[PDB]
Design a protein around this nucleic acid. Structure first.
Ligand code: CA
Ligand code: CA
Ligand code: CA
Ligand code: CA
Ligand code: CA
Ligand code: CA
Ligand code: CA
Ligand code: CA
Ligand code: CA
Ligand code: CA
Ligand code: CA
Ligand code: CA
Ligand code: CA
Lengths: 279, 279
RNA sequence: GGGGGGUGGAUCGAAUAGAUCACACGGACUCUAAAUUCGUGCAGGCGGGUGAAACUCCCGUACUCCCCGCCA
RNA sequence: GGGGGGUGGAUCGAAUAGAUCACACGGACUCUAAAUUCGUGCAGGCGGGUGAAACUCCCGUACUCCCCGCCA
């Protein structure tokens, strides 16, 4: 049966949020597939309208904000201190992330001028607060931020230009309790993101100390790390720590078991994982 | 009496939340001035640490974030649908706000390159989102968004480069309630950020309509507009509507009686309105 | 940085007066009602090319989407 | 686009083992603690000029803060 989905149709069935099943569908001929298509269309373009009617009359907000609040709260309970830094950082700020004019991401930055630039991460903004907060609060110190970071090659099925990040951290963790802490941290988040299935790829080096990631089979959900760290000095940090970076959208892509990420991102083409040109 | 806080002192009193009162305060000599300063400095620099105590063990979030929520949930009651549109718009889009290479706002924006840039407002994302929902949903359509906007030359005691903006709109307002409505919204939001004495300075020209500004006498908290409006043909909008733009930062600037806005804005120099370089 | 789509519901199209499903409206099927079935309305970004004819093919341009490297 | 500030707690400073208030540690006050007093510790981004001497004045650079227009 040598006639699966057309170039277009396949591509149009993502916008509409087809199950991998329906995607991997194929037919004997064409007139049968071209007709099976519009049978789905209605079915999907229908469902869309209903997810909207909910969102219109009870939920009043995108599935993207459902998470933000659910996560912030879940963390407030672990005593984390949610913060909210600026979104523009300086050329100076970056550099401190040993990222000279020749690092793989200095080419990945949205430059506003000589020394302004949209933040590729939350790290520098937290290193910075850490400085003045360490000096002021007895440890251990737990804070976090959810915020929209930017990256300008990033556009694909799991990658966007402006994505929503949750960087959470604990400054001053007993070097023993350091992994038990990540594992914890992580758990807390998924336990509240509604994900149950996850592996914990423990990456390990010497120059790159210990890298950690939160996996669901193939997909990466978070990248974690700890201190002391080689950057720590340029940020005037002399204490053990741990941090974790989740990519929200990424996660919505699993709590909602969808295929591409742009369904529930900052968009004017969707409103709550629902392509908006439907009828 | 003729010795008022030196330049340097006057400023360092700000960061610390010098009350309006104290910021005048003249002196009968410099010695007694210089001393009452350190007197108050200690006072302020110390209530700061107290504040941060609350922050770190009760609230877990700054005063901006807790407002977004108190504010959103409030509109959720009145059946608004909060959206989350992207912060990067296009040159294309901008034009549509009858901006042009001349409009004093074509200079207010941080350009990402040839055609993209950071949203100086929320309109062209709601105007955009408007298009479809007008189709799929019955009027009225109530939707709002709270998000970071951007301005470039904007850097003063009442303005920022990055301000959190709340823009709320209604599509399909009966021409007659077009006005009554604006008040309803206004009164919804303020009574959510607990604000009483408020003045609705109605501006009006036979050219822009009745451009509205939500104000507490001297300060402006919001600026709204209504349609049908001259832009509408460019956003294919053939319908009466009202809209209102708030700067959250400014609300805190009253709610928390403060003196400037950078105290609770996106910042690495503050944190819940408490200047950070304190001991 | 690159590839590939769509022309404000979309998918075919061997350029079928385009057709098909959707989607509004009215009628009948029925007292209802759903299942129908039927009637009709609803279409093609802008420039240039080809052509008998362009929505359909080429070139450009606008927007907007899917995707590859991204590590979220 | 433009002014004015600060040098990682900060404000005076007429440049002179800076000083003053904070802050940390200890005594003591009291039993202890607070308030409080004493003791000590805690200082000056980087380049160049001037100068007997520079943290203090001048030029310049780095970072950060406040302010005018901003219409949030
Ligand atoms: Ca293209
Ligand atoms: Ca029909
Ligand atoms: Ca069409
Ligand atoms: Ca033509
Ligand atoms: Ca086609
Ligand atoms: Ca083309
Ligand atoms: Ca300056
Ligand atoms: Ca001085
Ligand atoms: Ca003591
Ligand atoms: Ca002492
Ligand atoms: Ca000092
Ligand atoms: Ca010198
Ligand atoms: Ca200077």
């Amino acid at each position: 049966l040598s006639s699966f989905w057309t170039k277009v149709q396949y591509q149009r069935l993502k916008e509409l949020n087809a199950s991998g099943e329906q995607l991997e569908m194929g037919f004997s001929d064409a007139l049968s597939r071209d007709r099976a298509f519009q049978g789905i269309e209605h079915q999907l373009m229908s469902q869309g309208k209903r997810h909207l009617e909910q969102l219109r009359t009870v939920k009043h907000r995108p599935a993207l904000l459902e998470l933000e609040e659910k996560l912030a709260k879940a963390l407030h309970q672990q005593g984390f201190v949610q913060v909210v830094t600026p979104t523009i950082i300086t050329k100076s700020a970056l550099a401190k992330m040993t990222i000279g004019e020749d690092h793989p991401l200095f080419s990945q930055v949205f430059w506003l001028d000589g020394k302004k630039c949209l933040r590729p991460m939350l790290a520098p903004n937290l290193y910075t607060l850490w400085r003045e907060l360490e000096r002021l609060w007895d440890k251990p110190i737990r804070i976090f931020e959810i915020g929209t970071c930017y990256r300008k090659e990033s556009q694909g099925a799991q990658h966007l230009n402006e994505f929503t990040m949750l960087n959470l951290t604990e400054l001053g963790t007993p070097l023993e309790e350091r992994h038990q802490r990540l594992e914890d941290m992580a758990r807390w988040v998924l336990e509240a993101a509604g994900i149950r299935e996850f592996e914990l790829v423990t990456e390990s080096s010497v120059v790159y100390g210990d890298t950690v990631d939160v996996m669901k089979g193939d997909l990466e959900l978070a990248s974690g790390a700890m201190g002391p760290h080689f950057l720590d000095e340029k940020w005037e940090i002399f204490d053990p720590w741990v941090g974790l970076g989740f990519g929200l959208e990424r996660l919505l892509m699993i709590r909602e078991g969808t295929q591409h990420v742009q369904s529930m991102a900052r968009s004017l083409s969707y409103l709550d994982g629902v392509r908006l040109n439907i009828n």
